[PDB]
Amino acid sequence: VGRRALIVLAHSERTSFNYAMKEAAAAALKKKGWEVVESDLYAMNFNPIISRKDITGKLKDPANFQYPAESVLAYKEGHLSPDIVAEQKKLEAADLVIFQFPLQWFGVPAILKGWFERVFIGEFAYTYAAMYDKGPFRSKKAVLSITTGGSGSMYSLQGIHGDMNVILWPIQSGILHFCGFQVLEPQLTYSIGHTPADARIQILEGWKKRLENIWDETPLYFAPSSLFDLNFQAGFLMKKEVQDEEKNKKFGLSVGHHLGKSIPTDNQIKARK
Amino acid sequence: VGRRALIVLAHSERTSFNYAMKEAAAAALKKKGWEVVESDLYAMNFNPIISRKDITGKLKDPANFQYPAESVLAYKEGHLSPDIVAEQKKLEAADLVIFQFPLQWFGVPAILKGWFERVFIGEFAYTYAAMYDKGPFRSKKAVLSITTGGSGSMYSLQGIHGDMNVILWPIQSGILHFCGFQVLEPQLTYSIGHTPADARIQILEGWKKRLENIWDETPLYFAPSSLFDLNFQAGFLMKKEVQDEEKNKKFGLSVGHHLGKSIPTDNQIKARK
Numbered sequence: 001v002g003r004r005a006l007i008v009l010a011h012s013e014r015t016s017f018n019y020a021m022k023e024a025a026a027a028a029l030k031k032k033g034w035e036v037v038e039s040d041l042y043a044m045n046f047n048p049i050i051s052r053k054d055i056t057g058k059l060k061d062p063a064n065f066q067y068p069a070e071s072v073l074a075y076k077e078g079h080l081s082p083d084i085v086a087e088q089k090k091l092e093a094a095d096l097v098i099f100q101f102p103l104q105w106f107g108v109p110a111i112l113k114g115w116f117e118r119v120f121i122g123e124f125a126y127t128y129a130a131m132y133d134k135g136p137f138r139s140k141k142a143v144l145s146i147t148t149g150g151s152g153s154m155y156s157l158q159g160i161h162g163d164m165n166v167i168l169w170p171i172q173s174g175i176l177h178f179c180g181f182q183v184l185e186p187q188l189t190y191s192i193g194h195t196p197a198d199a200r201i202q203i204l205e206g207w208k209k210r211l212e213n214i215w216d217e218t219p220l221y222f223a224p225s226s227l228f229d230l231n232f233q234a235g236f237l238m239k240k241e242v243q244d245e246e247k248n249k250k251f252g253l254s255v256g257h258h259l260g261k262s263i264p265t266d267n268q269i270k271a272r273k
Numbered sequence: 274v275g276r277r278a279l280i281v282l283a284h285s286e287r288t289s290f291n292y293a294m295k296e297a298a299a300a301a302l303k304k305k306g307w308e309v310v311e312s313d314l315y316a317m318n319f320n321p322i323i324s325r326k327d328i329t330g331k332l333k334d335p336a337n338f339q340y341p342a343e344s345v346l347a348y349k350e351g352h353l354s355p356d357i358v359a360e361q362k363k364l365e366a367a368d369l370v371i372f373q374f375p376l377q378w379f380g381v382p383a384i385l386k387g388w389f390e391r392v393f394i395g396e397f398a399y400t401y402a403a404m405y406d407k408g409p410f411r412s413k414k415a416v417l418s419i420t421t422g423g424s425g426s427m428y429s430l431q432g433i434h435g436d437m438n439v440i441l442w443p444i445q446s447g448i449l450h451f452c453g454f455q456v457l458e459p460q461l462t463y464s465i466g467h468t469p470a471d472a473r474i475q476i477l478e479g480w481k482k483r484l485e486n487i488w489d490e491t492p493l494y495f496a497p498s499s500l501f502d503l504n505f506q507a508g509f510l511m512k513k514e515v516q517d518e519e520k521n522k523k524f525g526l527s528v529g530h531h532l533g534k535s536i537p538t539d540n541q542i543k544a545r546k
């Protein structure tokens with residue numbers, strides 16, 4: 001199980017449905033005995049812009065500044081900016097991490113994107129030596145709770161926007177899973193601005209209801225790293241044996257690993273595969 | 274053709290390859306007679322966080338602030354922050370827009386994501402009435418010039434990060450094409466951190482040579498809006514006739530419109546309708 005949860009909110013208005021979803025989550029969790037911490041990015045006036053100021057000490061190569069290396073070094077020697085360190089301490093303590101935000105330009109709000117860039121620092125959050133399912137957060141579970149302006153049909157296979165599974169991929173696989181998180185099914189709330197007040201009410205109650213057994217859910221399916229040649233002189237490509245065993249299979253493995261074939265239905269939205 | 278170009282750069286270091294790429298583009302375009310304008314976000318001390326601070330007038334409703342509606346009203350009544358107005362003026366004049374940036378967490382840097390959120394205001398950059406094909410920037414062309422830490426094989430169909438075409442979709446379709454932009458093939462320079470001094474110089478030269486005829490390039494293929502019933506009533510789904518006639522094709526129309534079938538090879542990387 002997990003007794004600790006962190007809720008990262010990315011919305012400036014306390015009168016928003018997003019703020020209401022954050023409160024709903026914290027209420028349901030505390031009631032079931034969880035310890036709940038929050039990161040209201042707008043409320044904290046969080047700094048989302050990566051810079052050399054994220055390193056407190058003196059740099060290794062100040063004339064040729066490379067963020068990845070200088071930040072990793074700062075993480076190891078203990079001199080990352082203290083606002084960054086405070087967020088990293090919350091992350092370390094949490095078993096479950098909920099990201100509550102409105103979809104903005106088919107992605108995460110800039111302030112949340114900056115939170116990832118500044119907080120998910122090398123070694124602490126990820127290592128090329130232990131990628132994806134073997135990452136640092138492999139004992140943690142993450143969930144995206146998203147609100148949208150567009151309707152669900154707009155995001156279906158035949159909607160103008162296209163499949164929502166493709167939109168979710170960069171985030172759930174590229175950011176969350178890459179660091180080791182077991183990613184749970186996303187809570188998707190479409191066209192919230194066109195939803196009746198009573199439906200909005202049931203949406204909040206259905207979220208609280210889901211959170212009651214969230215930890216026991218089966219996570220989304222991502223191709224295991226055991227299928228890849230985790231080394232540079234190999235190009236981190238799928239192992240030869242694995243490649244063959246797949247050539248006779250109708251479907252691809254995931255949205256990103258579709259292998260030029262059909263992507264299993266709702267790979268990024270529903271768990272079962 | 275187009276005589277005016279806007280280069281938006283998102284990198285904090287003047288010593289980076291990204292900065293080098295921007296300087297190469299500027300030089301190359303000016304040489305061929307282009308009028309070049311720049312938006313060096315970091316150097317412009319650019320604010321990427323959307324808030325009610327983006328509106329200078331009175332809010333139509335300060336009780337429950339809703340950014341989409343208020344910013345659209347501000348654009349119409351002329352109440353947008355001076356920095357947004359200046360960027361909108363740059364965009365309005367430009368024929369070609371180049372976005373130069375390093376890949377950060379499978380997406381654009383927070384500062385650039387924020388630039389889109391604050392600059393691409395409704396009415397100005399888009400209208401739900403004239404989405405994609407009929408968007409405001411339909412007479413403009415855009416291009417993404419991206420650098421990455423990971424190698425190309427890592428982003429191939431068998432690479433551990435998965436298909437790069439999926440990563441590029443949210444940006445090129447969801448942001449650029451949605452506003453009307455014709456999107457040209459992206460310039461992708463992989464593992465720039467493991468490329469010899471000799472090889473990087475040719476990259477710069479290769480980029481410069483491409484820009485000499487960039488305007489006469491065949492743009493990437495996105496399903497036309499004519500294939501969809503564009504109304505809340507219809508749910509914005511593909512026209513029935515299209516769905517049927519499409520059922521006999523092997524490949525879907527694009528990454529986002531894969532229709533549960535195979536994704537056309539390099540739909541977001543290579544042009545070929």
Ligand SMILES: Cc1cc2nc3c(=O)[nH]c(=O)nc-3n(C[C@H](O)[C@H](O)[C@H](O)COP(=O)(O)OP(=O)(O)OC[C@H]3O[C@@H](n4cnc5c(N)ncnc54)[C@H](O)[C@@H]3O)c2cc1C
Pocket residue numbers: 011015016017018019020101102103104105106107147148149150192193197200201204323337339340341389390391447
């Ligand atoms: C820059 C930008 C880019 C965007 N890009 C996209 C995009 O790419 N794709 C897309 O689909 N959408 C996009 N949107 C739209 C955005 O996704 C929606 O505006 C957002 O998800 C709406 O959520 P909200 O919390 O702001 O709700 P609000 O607009 O605040 O609305 C909440 C609604 O619920 C009511 N409410 C509030 N609290 C409660 C409560 N406790 N109980 C019951 N009812 C309550 C409110 O009165 C209101 O009717 C974009 C918006 C912006 C500003």
Ligand SMILES: Cc1cc2nc3c(=O)[nH]c(=O)nc-3n(C[C@H](O)[C@H](O)[C@H](O)COP(=O)(O)OP(=O)(O)OC[C@H]3O[C@@H](n4cnc5c(N)ncnc54)[C@H](O)[C@@H]3O)c2cc1C
Pocket residue numbers: 050064066067068116117118284288289290291292293374375376377378379380420421422423424465466470473474477
């Ligand atoms: C927060 C964050 C998240 C990231 N997420 C990802 C991700 O999801 N996927 C991924 O693949 N990568 C990721 N990266 C890595 C990032 O994409 C690379 O570090 C970046 O693209 C390198 O580009 P750069 O312009 O900074 O170059 P630099 O590291 O500066 O390197 C440029 C090289 O070219 C040399 N050079 C400079 N100017 C010139 C010139 N004029 N002519 C010739 N040579 C020159 C430099 O000295 C140096 O050796 C991430 C990095 C950060 C900080």
